[PDB]
Write a protein that binds this ligand. Structure first.
Ligand code: HEM
Length: 293
């Protein structure tokens, strides 16, 4: 059946220990600001948290964030993961300073820290992921393709136990960063800010004038005169009438999008993990700004 992965708290560690890790990540995000033409490492860390969680299969509980298996070559060389090496490199000195944190805890915490420092919603986070051996590394091909339609997106996300609202909310993370032709065969940002977490993805889908064009890798993407782009999968959220209603909702309610994204993102990062009844409550980390740091 399904594998069982029980959360086990890094020995003797508590909220204060993880806040220190959060702070080191946040401080380095501030420090290494030049990355990717001054976008900074925020977006790639969010993508790293999603990709290391998104291999999960609810049917048998393979993949998922628990095992921290991205550290192994099969997964880091996944063509779907091209570019994430930048996120992993960023995290190296963090892991060196705090060698006690598990890899899955670090990859997932990198995502939480990035969202929050980029002025996104608070994302409650739980510790206790435990490194698993190389033979537990899921095969390539569990991450989604971008050249597909709404039916594909809907079916894909059923494997991660996500419903329509959860899918649309999670996709709003595409406010962040950009596609890079050398990584994915798509080129351009989804919006203007790209290192500030807002509902701009939805506003842009609805409000820009989009043209279906071919990029330099001979792949179709939707382009706007403002210099933004949408993947076929992004654009499918306004082609499908059920997705469209939810896009409109998030475009018109920043708080609702924040609340829903926080729930879906924590869920994504926790899928596959069994938390003991007496496990600590989820942690809500203070930002550097809230700490006066
Ligand atoms: C249908 C599902 C999805 C597809 C097909 C997809 C596809 C892509 C592609 C092709 C890129 C560009 C990679 C590159 O060239 O560097 C990208 C970037 C990104 N994705 Fe997604 N994605 C999906 C869902 C998600 C989800 C659920 C999240 C998180 C909640 C996410 C977060 C990000 C972020 C933050 C970036 C920017 C990374 C950077 O700037 O380096 N994506 N995605």
């Amino acid at each position: 059946t399904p594998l069982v992965h029980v959360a086990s708290v890094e020995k003797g560690r508590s909220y204060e220990d993880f806040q220190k890790v959060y702070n080191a990540i946040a401080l380095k995000l501030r420090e290494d600001d030049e990355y990717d033409n001054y976008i900074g490492y925020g977006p790639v860390l969010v993508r790293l948290a999603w990709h290391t969680s998104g291999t999960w299969d609810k049917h048998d509980n393979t993949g998922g964030s628990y095992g921290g298996t991205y550290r192994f070559k099969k997964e880091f060389n996944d063509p779907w993961n091209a570019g994430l090496q930048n996120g992993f490199k960023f995290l190296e000195p963090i892991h060196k300073e705090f060698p006690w944190i598990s890899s899955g805890d670090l990859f997932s915490l990198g995502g939480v820290t990035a969202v929050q420092e980029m002025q996104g919603p608070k994302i409650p986070w739980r510790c206790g992921r435990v490194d698993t051996p190389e033979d537990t590394t899921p095969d390539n091909g569990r991450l989604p393709d971008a050249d597909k339609d709404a039916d594909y997106v809907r079916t894909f996300f059923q494997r991660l136990n996500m419903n329509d609202r959860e899918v649309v909310a999670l996709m709003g993370a595409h406010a962040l960063g950009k596609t890079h032709l050398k990584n994915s065969g798509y080129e351009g940002p989804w919006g203007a800010a790209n290192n500030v977490f807002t509902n701009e993805f939805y506003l842009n889908l609805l409000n820009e004038d989009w043209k279906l064009e071919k990029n330099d890798a001979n792949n179709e993407q939707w382009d706007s005169k403002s210099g933004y782009m949408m993947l076929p999968t992004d654009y499918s959220l306004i082609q499908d009438p059920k997705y469209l209603s939810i896009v409109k909702e998030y475009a018109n309610d920043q708080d609702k999008f924040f609340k829903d994204f926080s729930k879906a993102f924590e869920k994504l990062l926790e899928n596959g993990i069994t938390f003991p009844k007496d496990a600590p409550s989820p942690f809500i980390f203070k930002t550097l700004e809230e700490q006066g740091l």
